[PDB]
Write a protein that binds this ligand. Structure first.
Ligand SMILES: [C]C(=O)[N][C]1[C](O=P([O])([O])O[C][C]2O[C](OP([O])([O])=O)[C]([N]C([C])=O)[C](OC([C])=O)[C]2[O])O[C]([C]OP([O])(=O)O[C]2O[C]([C]OP([O])([O])=O)[C]([O])[C](OC([C])=O)[C]2[N]C([C])=O)[C](OC([C])=O)[C]1[O]
Lengths: 217, 211
């Protein structure tokens, strides 16, 4: 029913910066008392949401003084006066004036830091896997920034796409980086038909791709 | 910091029902509305409804009337949501919360699937045959989640990257990397530890160098 429109959907910010998240309801949020039930939550990775600001502008207790909120009618704003490393996570507005309570889409706050290139590492099939007739080839792309990366697989020069499983960590809370794992699974019979397996990563930090490879001897 | 205890995961079958529990404690359960929020991976918070443990009065979100049923037991200080006629759109994390007080529970990850619980295969990942060295653990073909993967019983927290599990045809795969200095391995042993309670699998894999 009542729609909350939250922007930006991603908030890149440097430590120390002022930032602003905005939330637009499609209806007045004044209740049957004079109050206006718009809240703000921060959900840190893995965790549940926590309450930052309630009723447009009042800082919830045990909430750092650098969060504050304001607005009226149909546009509302959560202001962060000085980003810290704690502050990464997803940020939501919610309205509670109207049943059903509705939440904004969220704004993922990214800590912006200096560029960092992937630490690529590749792994041949373990012996224990190969006896059971499977051949997985794993390749870690560790601690890079920014998050936009793309990994590629090369088998005896030619590219290979069917068989890959990709996974991506969230933004590390200590060094503000990103990692990715990629596994390419074949049978033992196909894997012994090839000689060279390569793992290629193209990222912002280089024009040339980072490449780690092995041969079966 | 956690007043509401919720089970961590729960596996259920399409078309079945499940009753999720939310155990209040350390406050007057009868004094505050209890709310239920759903979050599908890829975030997004949907409010399901609330109930007032003192009287039993409920409010439901029209999107969930046909799906959810909220109840209390004021003797045991427990709240219940029952999700019935389950499809895979009901796989999500389900939260109970006291809005007025900002009490939340940890959420329960509800998996809806026909797959039978399956035990992982754990493969050591030694480096290929120069200052730091990276090792891996491959955990493959298990169901459902979660698997719990530590390194040396959690004593190399720094330098560990565990990647979110990735599902494919009712089976999950899991990988973790650990990075130490070169003087540490194979000087000292590094063992990957895997637990998957749903299948009672609890195994260690010592990373041995290849050759
Ligand atoms: C509007 C709304 O809703 N809001 C919400 C609520 O919650 P709960 O408790 O859960 O409840 C639920 C209910 O509600 C209502 O009822 P009444 O009787 O009250 O009116 C309704 N709703 C609607 C939409 O309608 C119902 O439904 C029906 C009937 O249908 C439901 O179910 O509430 C809460 C709380 O609020 P308040 O009351 O207002 O209070 C608050 O505030 C105040 C003031 O202050 P300042 O700062 O601002 O100045 C205070 O005092 C208080 O304190 C305490 C602790 O208590 C409070 N605070 C807080 C933080 O809270 C809300 O919550 C919030 C957060 O807001 C919600 O949202």
């Amino acid at each position: 029913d009542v729609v909350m429109t939250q922007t930006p959907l991603s908030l890149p910010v440097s430590l120390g910066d002022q930032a602003s998240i905005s939330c637009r309801s499609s209806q007045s949020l004044i209740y049957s008392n004079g109050n206006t039930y718009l809240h703000w939550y921060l959900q840190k990775p893995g965790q549940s949401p926590k309450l930052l600001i309630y009723k447009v502008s009042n800082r919830f207790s045990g909430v750092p003084d650098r969060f504050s909120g304001s607005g009226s009618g149909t546009d509302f704003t959560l202001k962060i006066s000085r980003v810290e490393a704690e502050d990464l996570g997803v940020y939501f507005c919610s309205q509670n004036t109207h049943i059903p309570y509705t939440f904004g889409g969220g704004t993922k706050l990214e800590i912006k830091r200096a560029d960092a290139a992937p630490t690529v590492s590749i792994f041949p099939p373990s012996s224990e896997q190969l006896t059971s007739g499977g051949a997985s080839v794993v390749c870690f792309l560790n601690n890079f920034y920014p998050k936009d990366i793309n990994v590629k697989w090369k088998i005896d020069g030619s590219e290979r796409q069917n068989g890959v499983l990709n996974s991506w960590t969230d933004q590390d809370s200590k060094d503000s980086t990103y990692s990715m794992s990629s596994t390419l699974t074949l049978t033992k019979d196909e894997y012994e038909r090839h000689n060279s397996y390569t793992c290629e990563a193209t990222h912002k930090t280089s024009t040339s791709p980072i490449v780690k490879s092995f041969n079966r001897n | 910091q956690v007043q509401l205890q919720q089970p961590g995961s729960e596996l259920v079958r399409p078309g079945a029902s499940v009753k999720l529990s939310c155990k209040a404690s350390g406050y007057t359960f009868t004094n505050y509305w209890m709310h239920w929020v759903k979050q599908r991976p890829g975030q997004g918070l949907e409010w399901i409804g609330n109930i007032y443990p003192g009287s039993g009065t409920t409010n439901y979100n029209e999107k969930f009337k046909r799906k959810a049923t909220l109840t209390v037991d004021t003797s045991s200080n427990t709240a219940y949501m029952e999700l019935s006629s389950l499809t895979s759109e009901d796989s999500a994390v389900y939260f109970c919360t006291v809005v007025r007080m900002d009490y939340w529970g940890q959420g329960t990850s509800v998996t809806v699937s026909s797959a039978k619980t399956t035990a992982p295969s754990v493969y050591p990942l030694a480096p290929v045959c120069g200052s730091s060295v990276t090792l891996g653990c491959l955990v493959k073909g298990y169901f459902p989640e979660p698997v719990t993967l530590t390194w040396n019983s959690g004593s190399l927290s720094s330098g560990v990257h565990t990647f979110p599990a990735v599902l494919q045809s009712d089976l999950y795969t899991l990988s973790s990397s650990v990075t130490v200095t070169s003087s540490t391995w194979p000087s000292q042993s590094i063992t990957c530890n895997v637990a998957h309670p749903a299948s009672s699998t609890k195994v260690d894999k010592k990373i041995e160098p290849r050759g």
